[PDB]
Amino acid sequence: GTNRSLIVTTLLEEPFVMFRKSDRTLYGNDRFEGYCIDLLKELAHILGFSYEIRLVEDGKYGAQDDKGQWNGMVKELIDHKADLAVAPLTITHVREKAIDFSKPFMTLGVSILYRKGTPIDSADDLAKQTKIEYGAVKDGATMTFFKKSKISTFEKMWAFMSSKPSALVKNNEEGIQRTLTADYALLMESTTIEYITQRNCNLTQIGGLIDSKGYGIGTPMGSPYRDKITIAILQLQEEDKLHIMKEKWWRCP
Amino acid sequence: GTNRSLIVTTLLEEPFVMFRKSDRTLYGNDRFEGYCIDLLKELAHILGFSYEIRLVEDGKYGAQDDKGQWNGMVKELIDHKADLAVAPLTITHVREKAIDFSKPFMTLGVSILYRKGTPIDSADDLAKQTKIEYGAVKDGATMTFFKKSKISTFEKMWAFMSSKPSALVKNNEEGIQRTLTADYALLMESTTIEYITQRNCNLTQIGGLIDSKGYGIGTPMGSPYRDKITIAILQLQEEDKLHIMKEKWWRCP
Ligand SMILES: N[C@@H](CCC(=O)O)C(=O)O
Ligand SMILES: N[C@@H](CCC(=O)O)C(=O)O
Ligand SMILES: [Cl-]
Ligand SMILES: [Cl-]
Ligand SMILES: [Cl-]
Ligand SMILES: [Cl-]
Ligand code: NA
Ligand code: NA
Ligand code: NA
Numbered sequence A, B: 001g002t003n004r005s006l007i008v009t010t011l012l013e014e015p016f017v018m019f020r021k022s023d024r025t026l027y028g029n030d031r032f033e034g035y036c037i038d039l040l041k042e043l044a045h046i047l048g049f050s051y052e053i054r055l056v057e058d059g060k061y062g063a064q065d066d067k068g069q070w071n072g073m074v075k076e077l078i079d080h081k082a083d084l085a086v087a088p089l090t091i092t093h094v095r096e097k098a099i100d101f102s103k104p105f106m107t108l109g110v111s112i113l114y115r116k117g118t119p120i121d122s123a124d125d126l127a128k129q130t131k132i133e134y135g136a137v138k139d140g141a142t143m144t145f146f147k148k149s150k151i152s153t154f155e156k157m158w159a160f161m162s163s164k165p166s167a168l169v170k171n172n173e174e175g176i177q178r179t180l181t182a183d184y185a186l187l188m189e190s191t192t193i194e195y196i197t198q199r200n201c202n203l204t205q206i207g208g209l210i211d212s213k214g215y216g217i218g219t220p221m222g223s224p225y226r227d228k229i230t231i232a233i234l235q236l237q238e239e240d241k242l243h244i245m246k247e248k249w250w251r252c253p
Helices: A035-047 A072-078 A123-127 A141-148 A152-161 A172-181 A190-199 A226-238 A241-250 B035-047 B072-078 B123-127 B141-148 B152-161 B172-181 B190-199 B226-238 B241-250
Strands: A006-010 A051-055 A084-090 A099-101 A106-108 A110-115 A133-135 A184-189 A203-206 A213-220 B006-010 B051-055 B084-090 B099-101 B106-108 B110-115 B133-135 B184-189 B203-206 B213-220
Touching: A006 A072, A035 A051, A035 A084, A035 A226, A035 A241, A072 A084, A072 A099, A072 A213, A084 A106, A106 A190, A110 A172, A110 A190, A123 A152, A133 A152, A141 A152, A141 A184, A172 A184, A172 A203, A184 A190, A190 A203, A190 A241, A213 A226, A226 A241, B006 B072, B035 B051, B035 B084, B035 B226, B035 B241, B072 B084, B072 B099, B072 B213, B084 B106, B106 B190, B110 B172, B110 B190, B123 B152, B133 B152, B141 B152, B141 B184, B172 B184, B172 B203, B184 B190, B190 B203, B190 B241, B213 B226, B226 B241
Parallel strands: A006 A051, A006 A084, A133 A184, B006 B051, B006 B084, B133 B184
Antiparallel strands: A084 A213, A099 A213, A106 A213, A110 A184, A110 A203, B084 B213, B099 B213, B106 B213, B110 B184, B110 B203
């Protein structure tokens, strides 16, 4: 209870959480590596806890349907099926109504991922047309941002995204593949765009950040572990350790 | 001191925290009433704690200066000079880097307060001119939102606000008085606009919400009281008690 291993829910998302490469068939925690895994390891060392990592079955971050029911990692936390969600889980007002988060460990904002070619320069350029299709990860924070926005440009974008069955993609990976194979722009969080555009040299960020927010480790509301994790994150940041960790995992003509 | 009274920092802001009317000279907690005071009282009853309310000396909510030093209620929490900040304290990413918040007890967004007359309709209308001056409360969340935005319209607005000495006002009251005596629009949080426009029938909200976020009870990072307060808030909301409390305090031709 006070010594048990914490159940950690996560999902695969480069470079935060990945299956590490090996010839062996791997099992347990050893399967995983990445920025969020390094963060979890450092926290576990500092705070003296152990854990078991489990992939969220539905592969989603989490959003509410019209009856108010959640899915994804958010639902795992609400149900107390996990103690921590260690992932690039965006801290949002709608989620703070249902679950808790550590202090943020990374800052990001929504922006646009698109192929180098047609020189569009902003969301305004996307919103005023449909030839270039656009969308976001289904049941993630970006989708929810557009769904909830009352800013005219973003309302127009939500009207389009939500009417076009192909527009909302299962995960970043499907979205990135779409930007590579179709005339499609993905509304994406900015540090992920940074990572992707350093590796796919034909992709680029379009425009700037639409907002500025954070990723946190999710917990069930009122978790006994959340506070110590927050304080440990704060101290890692005072010493620039998270900046260094980012450089490790983010490290074109 | 697991029985000690909690120190509560606050500031005067109608209808959240106000000096109650009396012929007597009042002292201590008895001086205060309002939506946030009712919320505090209900939480204290549910959770079995006592408190001493103190007005923040500088009358500010809190923002960081160029060297990263905070002021206002946020600084009181950072310094652990208060246990709770019971006020309409906006939950924001930049603040979550330094302090903690309960789950939100109220949803709001930035909008515009302006005198019925010139029929402007949106922030875009303000941003494209200067005859109608505009601004926000100095060292509050709205100011910070504009200072940090990379959305073109809001960048232009910040460029103007931050150049014009009169534009940033000390508190809502000064800003409201300014909308009444000058051709000035105040960027203001929406539930406060709702309260003000029901009482000052010559004022109105211009446009919709620019964002959607929450007020929470602020605590120092690491607080032993924050979780129980969050759970109690959740349960008040499940039963619609906060909606009823808003009707009480918010209740023209
Ligand atoms: N990090 C997001 C998912 C990605 C996105 O929505 O763009 C979340 O927590 O929902
Ligand atoms: N509620 C705001 C102050 C008002 C404003 O910024 O509009 C805060 O917590 O900073
Ligand atoms: Cl698994
Ligand atoms: Cl850091
Ligand atoms: Cl006082
Ligand atoms: Cl309620
Ligand atoms: Na393998
Ligand atoms: Na007591
Ligand atoms: Na009196």
